Design a protein around this ligand. Structure first.
Ligand SMILES: OC[C@H]1O[C@](O)(CO)[C@@H](O)[C@@H]1O
Ligand code: NA
Length: 162
């Protein structure tokens, strides 16, 4: 098992998801999603994320407090195309952004993305540097997942602690 995670029940919502020696690979034009059967309310959730060459060289994301369809929930991402770390939400099937931090995000560079969620408060860390501290009260609990946007991206050491 080349994909390292402490979570299981990984079930594709859409896009294409496969395990490689670099970890779990997602690939789509636009947004796509894979959900774990694992669920949570307050937690730390993290992954190594690498944007590969291909598609639009866009983004890879943690997803959390997600509904069963990935139509509602929170994401934190690294976006190579836009040079952004975004904290955002889907609500009623569409995305809107809560906070975003500007920094160069390079293709083929491994980033460690960490989210700490506690009640309505979220702290997002990029390679251990705190970059976003935000509030949003829309979702309190749900499934963990992963997302890519206009990208091929690879996720490794995907872990939850609570
Ligand atoms: O940064 C990429 C992300 O940006 C969004 O357009 C939200 O602004 C999402 O659809 C996509 O996953
Ligand atoms: Na970039």
């Amino acid at each position: 098992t080349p994909f390292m995670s402490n979570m299981t029940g990984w079930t594709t919502v859409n896009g294409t998801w496969a395990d490689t020696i670099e970890g779990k690979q997602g690939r789509s034009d636009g947004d796509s999603f894979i959900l774990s059967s694992a669920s949570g309310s307050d937690f730390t959730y993290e992954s190594d994320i690498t944007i590969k060459d291909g598609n639009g060289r866009g983004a890879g994301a943690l997803m959390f407090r997600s509904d069963k369809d990935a139509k509602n929930g929170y994401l934190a991402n690294v976006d190579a195309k836009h040079d952004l770390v975004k904290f955002f939400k889907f609500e009623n099937g569409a995305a809107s952004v809560i906070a975003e931090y500007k920094t160069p995000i390079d293709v083929n560079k491994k980033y460690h993305l960490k989210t700490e969620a506690e009640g309505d408060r979220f702290k997002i860390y990029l390679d251990d540097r705190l970059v976003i501290d935000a509030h949003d009260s829309v979702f309190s609990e749900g499934q963990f997942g992963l997302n890519v946007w206009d990208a091929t991206a690879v996720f490794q050491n995907v872990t939850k602690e609570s």
